[PDB]
């Protein structure tokens, strides 16, 4: 049949792939390191891309792309969109950003800030200030110029986040999931104060730990598309579609068209598909910025078994067949 | 992109392409190696015939 | 003119000697009974093709070459074979019983008993070059012969012609091509043991030879024949600047100097194109031959350069090509493909060509083509075949599986932790050369 | 190049006929020792096993060894009986009465100098001796007793030349005396020390596979023995025809044996079939994997394995049979050490078998050959606990204590399997 081995046991998402290869009847776990397996779940860090693909008569898929950490660790997405002329150091949906280490631009950084709205955020401090931030740094991190007029969701006054989850297979074909989720701050916005991280960071465990009246108006402080899509149809009298996932979409095509010849798998010894976690923040111009890309994201509980099952169809079966909750973004 | 030390010859030619600048054992050791590994060899086959001749 | 000496050790080594030596012949016009017609001058000269051919009285050019085994059958298929009136019998060295995949048994059992009689047989080569320049040695890694008699040859030769230059060819194992479970063992304890003692060398995997028969041949089963007239292409095209009239690469210490700024990362990656089934064909351009050597599939180690950094870069062409055309596919691929290289070493290409077209043996597997290249870099990407090779390496080596047959050879186990020490010193060159460092 | 053959003991002579008519059938030699084959070949490494006598004759590498005649003469008289050089039969008149003791110690002794003679003779002929294979019984006093006596003299005298064997473990299913668990707990012994390589063939496999598989209700020596001369023919392929493998007895030994005292082996055939019928590849491929093809009466499931070889004979896709391999190793993943990489070699050899479009030979060095090892030891302790028929061996000049001895040896055999097991 089709074997598999499971080398990171904390994946929430693999835990729930595995379970299902499993109950098809054609799929087999090995132990960690058994050479002869068809799919790899890898891990996270230090994986050893050099060893696949060398089993004879073995096809080989393993669930990271090798070099899509360009896009998934923070100083090296700036560099990145910075370096590639597809992007540009121009590009008008990453807030400007710097590297800078306690190659570096802290030069750079201070010359737009004297040149100033004037709050950045290094990554956590959030300031006004530059002295307090590169010190704070001393004590590798990126500053960027943090969106002091983000979309407030009503009633509330409350920032959010939205979280896309992007799935790329083994021929580069580029799958947003249909369903994504706002991760939303329950405490209100306060441009006065950015001591009080509470309601400047919208991370779920900042609001399950900090935030009082946390779950208040949606549960688990997640909202879904059908609702925030019937929010901005009742307030702003757009859709969701046209206000932002338009941008969603060209944002995501832009980042993975930038970086597939450096990683794409056509043509090699092995396979790589990968599920990505795209952050965007929108202001309250419905312009929607880029704030990082997640290489191995975690899935709202509702949205597992959809996603997961979709993972299976698309990237694994669709290269070890057995006896759309995607879009499919053209490129 | 430069073109530099160009030869050329009846048989063909050769050139650069610059694109961007940048920014032992003697035979005593041996022999001994291979006689140790020998004597070795002696030592185990003499422990075998020993044993064979217990 | 400087002379160059062909040492072919082994099953692999013998094997593929044949298959070069005849392309050779094929290449310069030498008939098998080693009549040259076209060389005007009887009984000597100074041209480039005496670096590898001598001549006698009659006009025969023989090879400057030797032939080494543990037992006889490979090379008394020499000795009977097409090319049999090339050699001299001195020239030609067996034993009689082989090294049965050992290592040990190669290098100190019988190696010791043969090393002698090698040497003054390569003496007698040697004695007839006006200006030796060096040793161009072809085995496998996973052979007891061509990993333990080569490694123990390499020693003496470093002993006996201190200043001469050794280039290596050096068949990697692999499943797909019959192996012995122990090749890991064997290919680690030799690397280790000839490493200082090789100038460059150029690895052949298996896997990759036996992935372009399938692929580009279209041959479902490739044999030996099939692997080595594939290779022997690739060798000719690394040693035809030494055997033509040429300006790049003319002696072996331009290959070090070329692509091997650090002594123990002289494993430079070749990549040959076009491979083209003879049983077809549409002419494929300098642009498009050029693009196809930083295709992986192309490769004779599969490895990802794009994952990697390149220290230095040779494109030897044959054929039809101009520098105008070479110059127009370099722009081109430098704007399309991943190719970094480290901060100290110029982003360039050194790049040679040949007018001569490959030649290919008639009857052969290969199509003749109008022009061919054979790309030489040296990238950190090749680290991913030692990697592959350490590893295997290390599951037998924890349960000491094996090993018992290496020690009843003579050798200390601690020969093998020590050439394993080595392999990981030098896996950290390679690392500390080709990673930016990744975020935590 | 050459190997020198022993067959010693009724059973170890009965194989040992049957497999040179085998061999001399597959190379083209009559029963007069001339070749008539057809193709170069059956004559390319003919040498391996037979000298070329004078009158292009040519003549089995081997000694024929027995403490009686009856046997020995049934071979002077059997099929190709006139092949053997007839000074190569040595042979006493006592018998050894079914005792290792005898075999190893008292008759056995008067007769091991004079078999020495003639394995001294045929190895100073050799242009360069690979080793030596002996077919023998474990159960029995001449094969068993006088067969390990052999196999120490000749290491002595030539210590570093390849020693294989062929030995037939007893089974009480098909017995002839109750002693059997001691001879060949006695000879085991023998066999870790002294072997580089033991094909175990168990008379209960063999009986079994006549019986279920074949339909012979009523199983003989000679059905038996039809398996294994047919067995040996196939793991000597890789000796005795041109392949491209370039396999001796030394690199036999050195890829399947890890550990120098693990070198015990499952074989197996197939086809077994009760036929005209053509076998597919997967066909073929599934048999020989199957517990009920192998000749060791132990389950493979119930151990993994350290190293295959899978031989193959006849025309066939040499694509199939890697599809095929790869996914019988697919369904048997649990039952390979992960730390032998590459650890299942494949063979293929284009000369079928007489009789057979193809076949395959299965040689397995498996963990799970504890078993058999442990059922010898169980019959072993049974008896000895009680010391019984143990006046048989006393009255040689043998101790207990050897007995303690062996069966303690045995166990840390099996200990060692158990070791690896569970790596
Ligand atoms: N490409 C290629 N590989 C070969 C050839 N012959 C053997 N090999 C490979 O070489 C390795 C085996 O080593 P050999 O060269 O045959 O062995 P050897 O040097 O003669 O040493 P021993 O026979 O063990 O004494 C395996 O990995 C084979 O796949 C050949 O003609 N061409
Ligand atoms: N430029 C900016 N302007 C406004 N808010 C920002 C910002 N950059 C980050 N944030 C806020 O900080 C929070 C966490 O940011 P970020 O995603 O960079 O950290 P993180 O990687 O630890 C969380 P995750 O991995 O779940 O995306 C975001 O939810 C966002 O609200
Ligand atoms: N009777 C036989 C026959 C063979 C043979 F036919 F050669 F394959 C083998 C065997 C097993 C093996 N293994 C490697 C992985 C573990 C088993 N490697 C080889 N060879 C043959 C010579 O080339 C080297 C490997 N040979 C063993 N016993
Ligand atoms: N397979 C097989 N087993 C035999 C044959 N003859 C005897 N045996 C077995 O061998 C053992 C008896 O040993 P045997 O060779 O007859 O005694 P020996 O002459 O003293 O060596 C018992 O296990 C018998 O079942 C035979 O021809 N074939
Ligand atoms: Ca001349
Ligand atoms: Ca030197
Ligand atoms: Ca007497
Ligand atoms: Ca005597
Ligand atoms: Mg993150
Ligand atoms: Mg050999
Ligand atoms: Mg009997």
């Not at chain 1, 990453?94 to 955020?121: C, K």
């Not at chain 1, 056509?266 to 396979?271: G, P, S």
């Not at chain 4, 009158?55 to 590498?61: H, T």
Request: one cysteine or more; proline letters at 4%; aromatic letters at 10%.
């Amino acid at each position: 049949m089709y074997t598999f081995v499971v080398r990171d046991e904390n994946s929430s998402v693999y835990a729930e792939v595995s379970r299902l290869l499993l109950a098809t009847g054609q799929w087999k776990r090995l132990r960690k390191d058994n050479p002869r397996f068809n799919l790899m779940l890898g891990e996270r860090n230090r994986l050893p891309f050099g060893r696949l693909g060398h089993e004879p008569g073995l096809v080989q898929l393993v669930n990271y792309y090798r070099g899509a950490d360009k896009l998934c660790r923070k100083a090296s997405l700036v560099k990145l969109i910075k370096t590639s002329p597809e992007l540009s150091e121009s590009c008008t949906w990453f807030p400007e950003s710097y590297v800078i280490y306690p190659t570096d631009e802290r030069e750079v950084f201070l010359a737009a800030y004297n040149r100033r709205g004037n709050v950045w955020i290094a990554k956590i401090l959030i300031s006004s200030e530059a002295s307090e931030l590169l010190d704070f740094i001393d004590e590798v991190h990126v500053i960027q110029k943090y969106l002091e007029k983000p979309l407030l969701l009503e009633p509330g006054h409350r920032k959010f986040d939205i979280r896309s989850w992007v799935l790329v297979d083994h021929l580069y074909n580029i799958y947003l999931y249909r369903e994504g989720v706002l991760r939303t701050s329950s405490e209100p916005y306060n441009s006065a104060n950015f001591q009080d991280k509470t309601c400047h960071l919208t991370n779920h465990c900042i609001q399950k730990e900090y935030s009082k009246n946390y779950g208040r108006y949606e549960e688990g402080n997640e909202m879904f598309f059908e609702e925030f899509n019937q929010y901005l149809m009742d307030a702003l009298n757009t859709t969701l579609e046209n206000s932002i996932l338009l941008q969603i979409k060209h944002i995501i095509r832009s980042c993975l068209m930038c970086i597939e010849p450096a990683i794409s798998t056509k043509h090699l010894h092995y396979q790589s598909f990968q599920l990505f976690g795209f952050d965007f923040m929108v202001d309250e111009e419905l312009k929607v910025w880029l704030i990082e890309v997640n290489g191995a994201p975690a899935c709202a509980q509702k949205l597992y078994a959809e996603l997961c099952q979709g993972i299976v169809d698309v990237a694994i079966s669709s290269v070890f067949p057995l006896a759309s909750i995607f879009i499919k973004l053209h490129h | 992109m430069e073109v530099i030390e160009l030869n050329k010859c009846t048989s063909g030619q050769s050139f650069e392409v610059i694109l961007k600048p940048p920014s032992d054992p003697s035979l005593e050791e041996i022999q001994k190696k291979l006689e140790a590994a020998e004597e070795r060899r002696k030592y185990q086959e003499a422990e075998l015939l020993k044993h064979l001749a217990e | 003119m400087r002379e160059c000496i062909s040492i072919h050790v082994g099953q692999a080594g013998v094997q593929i000697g044949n298959a070069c030596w005849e392309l050779y012949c094929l290449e310069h016009g030498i008939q098998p009974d080693g009549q040259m017609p076209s060389d005007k001058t009887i009984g000597g000269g100074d041209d480039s093709f005496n670096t590898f051919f001598s001549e006698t009285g009659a006009g025969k050019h023989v090879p400057r070459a030797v032939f080494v085994d543990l037992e006889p059958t490979v090379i008394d298929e020499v000795r009977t074979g097409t090319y049999r009136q090339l050699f001299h019998p001195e020239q030609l060295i067996t034993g009689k019983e082989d090294a049965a995949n050992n290592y040990a048994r190669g290098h100190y059992t019988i190696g010791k008993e043969i090393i002698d009689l090698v040497l003054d047989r390569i003496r007698k080569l040697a004695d007839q070059c006006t200006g030796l320049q060096g040793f161009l040695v072809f085995h496998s890694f996973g052979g007891g012969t061509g990993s333990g008699f080569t490694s123990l040859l390499m020693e003496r030769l470093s002993v006996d012609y201190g200043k001469k230059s050794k280039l290596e060819f050096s068949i990697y194992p692999a499943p797909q091509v019959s192996t012995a479970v122990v090749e890991p063992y064997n290919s680690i304890l030799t690397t280790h043991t000839t490493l200082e003692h090789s100038d460059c060398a150029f690895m052949v995997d298996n896997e990759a030879i036996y992935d372009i028969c399938r692929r580009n041949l279209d041959i479902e089963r490739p044999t030996y024949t099939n692997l080595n007239r594939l290779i022997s292409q690739i060798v000719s095209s690394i040693t035809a600047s030494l055997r033509f009239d040429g300006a790049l690469n003319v002696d072996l210490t331009e290959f070090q100097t070329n692509l091997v700024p650090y002594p123990r990362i002289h494993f430079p990656l070749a990549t040959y194109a076009p491979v083209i089934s003879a049983e077809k064909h549409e002419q494929l351009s300098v642009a498009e031959i050029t693009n196809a050597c930083f295709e992986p599939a192309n490769q004779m180690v599969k490895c990802d350069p794009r994952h990697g950094k390149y220290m230095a870069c040779c494109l030897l062409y044959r054929g039809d090509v101009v520098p105008k055309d070479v110059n127009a596919a370099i722009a081109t691929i430098k704007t399309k493909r991943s190719i970094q290289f480290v901060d100290w070493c110029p982003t360039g290409f050194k790049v040679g060509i040949n007018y001569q077209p490959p030649t290919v043996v008639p009857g052969g597997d290969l199509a003749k083509v109008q022009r061919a290249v054979c790309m030489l870099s040296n990238t950190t990407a090749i680290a991913e075949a030692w990697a592959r090779l350490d590893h295997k390496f290390d599951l037998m080596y924890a349960k000491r599986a094996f090993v018992h047959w290496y020690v009843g050879e003579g050798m200390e186990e601690g020969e093998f932790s020590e050439a394993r020490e080595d392999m990981a010193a030098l896996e950290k060159d390679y690392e500390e050369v080709g990673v930016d460092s990744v975020e935590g | 190049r050459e190997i020198v053959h022993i067959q010693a003991g009724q059973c170890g002579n009965q194989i040992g006929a049957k497999f040179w008519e085998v061999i001399s059938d597959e190379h083209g030699i009559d029963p007069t020792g001339s070749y008539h084959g057809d193709s170069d070949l059956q004559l390319e490494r003919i040498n391996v096993y037979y000298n070329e006598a004078t009158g292009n004759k040519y003549v089995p590498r081997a000694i024929l060894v027995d403490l009686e005649p009856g046997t020995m003469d049934s071979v002077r008289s059997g099929p190709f009986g006139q092949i053997f050089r007839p000074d190569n039969f040595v042979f006493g008149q006592s018998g050894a009465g079914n005792n290792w003791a005898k075999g190893h110690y008292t008759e056995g002794a008067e007769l091991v100098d004079s078999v020495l003679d003639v394995v001294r003779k045929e190895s100073e002929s050799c242009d360069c001796l690979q080793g030596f294979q002996l077919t023998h019984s474990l159960g029995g006093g001449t094969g068993s007793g006088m067969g390990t006596l052999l196999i120490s003299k000749i290491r002595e005298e030539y210590p570093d030349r390849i020693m294989n064997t062929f030995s037939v473990m007893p089974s009480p299913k098909v017995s002839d005396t109750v002693v059997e668990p001691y001879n060949a707990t006695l000879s085991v012994h023998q066999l870790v020390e002294n072997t580089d390589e033991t094909y175990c063939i168990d008379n209960e496999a063999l009986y079994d596979i006549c019986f279920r598989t074949l339909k012979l209700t009523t199983p003989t020596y000679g059905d038996l023995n039809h398996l294994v001369s047919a067995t040996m023919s196939g793991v000597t392929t890789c000796l005795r025809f041109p392949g491209q493998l370039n396999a001796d007895l030394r690199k036999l030994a050195v890829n399947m044996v890890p550990f120098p005292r693990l070198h015990f082996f499952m074989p197996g055939f197939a086809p077994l079939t009760s036929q005209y019928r053509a076998l597919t590849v997967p066909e073929l491929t599934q048999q020989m994997f199957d517990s009920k093809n192998m000749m060791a009466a132990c389950d493979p499931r119930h151990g993994r394995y350290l190293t295959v070889a899978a031989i193959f004979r006849g025309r066939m896709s040499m694509k199939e049979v890697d599809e095929q391999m790869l996914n019988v190793q697919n369904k048997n993943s649990s039952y390979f050490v992960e730390w032998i990489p590459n650890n299942v070699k494949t063979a293929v050899c284009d000369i079928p078998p007489r009789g057979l479009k193809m076949s395959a030979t299965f040689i397995g060095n498996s963990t799970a050959i504890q078993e058999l090892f442990k059922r010898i030891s169980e019959q072993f302790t049974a008896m000895f606990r009680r010391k019984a028929f143990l006046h048989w061996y006393t009255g040689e000049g043998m101790d207990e204590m050897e007995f303690t001895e062996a069966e303690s040896n045995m166990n840390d055999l099996v200990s060692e399997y158990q070791q690896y097991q569970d790596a």
